[PDB]
Symmetry: D2
């Protein structure tokens, strides 16, 4: 059993991102999302699956999907932004298991990743605990 506990940091008062969706991929006996002591906790039944969080800022027409998982016993993460209205977390989460560019992101097994949207705002995931079964990460909104 793995857990990934996520702390969300919203660094600028320009815009307001709110949680809108949390999904679990079906591999490795699935997983769950819990809220624990102000953090988002993804629990997974083994190595080889993942979960996604979507955040939306309706003030500024911005959004992103942040995905966290374990691939071949190493943690991974990705962020997708510039989302179409069809790109919910349900959609994005699944694409990491068949879409070459998404597959690659997962295979990279990154301890940190950042990307910016077309509006110039950057988002980042930073794993603070990178080993073991109780992983920890910061999700930083620029």
């Amino acid at each position: 059993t793995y857990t990934i506990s996520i702390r969300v940091y919203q660094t600028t008062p320009k815009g307001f991102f709110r949680p809108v969706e949390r999904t679990n991929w079906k591999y490795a006996n699935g997983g769950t999302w819990d809220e624990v002591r102000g953090e988002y906790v993804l629990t997974m039944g083994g190595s080889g699956t993942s979960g996604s969080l979507r955040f939306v800022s309706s003030d500024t027409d911005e959004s992103f999907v942040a995905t966290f998982g374990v691939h071949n016993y190493k943690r991974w993460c990705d962020i997708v932004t510039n989302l179409t209205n069809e790109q919910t977390a349900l959609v994005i989460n699944q694409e990491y298991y068949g879409v070459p560019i998404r597959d690659q992101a997962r295979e990279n097994q990154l301890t940190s990743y950042n990307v910016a949207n077309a509006k110039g705002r950057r988002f980042a995931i930073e794993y603070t605990v990178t080993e073991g079964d109780n992983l920890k990460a910061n999700l930083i909104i620029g």
Copy 2:
């Protein structure tokens, strides 16, 4: 714009169901899940999409996925229980748009539905507001 506001009633202190997943289907410009005054609010861009909530009782090995949406301008609902580990809300939500046994449930446009798991526990959805833009439902865990 449609909203479905859901009040959850957990009625029996045997086991404990906790929220573990909330998904949005990609049709009709997608949608969002918000927590509002103790209720779950599914917001959708138009008719033809849906969202799912999964609840799990770890203590009793029980779970279900409750799905809510609008089909041909009428509200619908369904509950799936006796879940395998592979049947996350991400999986179940998607099945309502291609899997015949799920398609037909959506097409039924039900104002109420109830089902039992293998242990005999009943789960119910009852829409209290069945018309207009802002729909309301009770999710009752037996």
Copy 3:
């Protein structure tokens, strides 16, 4: 360090109680309230303090304050209902340290307590784990 983890059960779809307030008394190095896996967790720095939760049903003009603590190394609980508009949880929590009838409730060190409001609805606290530093309780709304 003590924890009291509380599972809330709302047993009837008549009315809807929502959380509106959570307070910590100042004795025994204070305490905190956390949301953990769908439960309300009161953490306290020792024996001799408590915390309160207030729930309101605006549909039916009903409310109550449920208080949980440890007195002389034994758990206690109480419920106050038929609240005046001045009886917030901030007020009620404090009254267990100076008001004779409230003092008595605390001194009783009950593993279970129930009371009904003037409208005929009963509320109950039931400790499922009654010993140790990780106590557990059901808050049952009739």
Copy 4:
């Protein structure tokens, strides 16, 4: 009826502040705290009362209480930090109605306030809507 809707911005991934307490003062027929679309909403019956939020960073031994309300039909705010274990939100909220050093802060009817703790971390409240029934504020953690 007044509302104050609060957006929380945690801006620095050093330490992690989590919500631990939310209180309502008893004047003006009291009030409630609700979570609405990722925001904290304080609702009050009329002018002359307030509510407090406490946040704690366990990893860095930091904490603060942020208080919001309406005094003589104008919004007010304050932040207290460098807290002892005995300074819960229940304690601090009440002090604004009898303790001169707190009374004067309420009477100031501030649209913005900022303060630093002993470690040099700044905390700020800025009202973005300063007039009418439905007030809005940012709570910024430095």
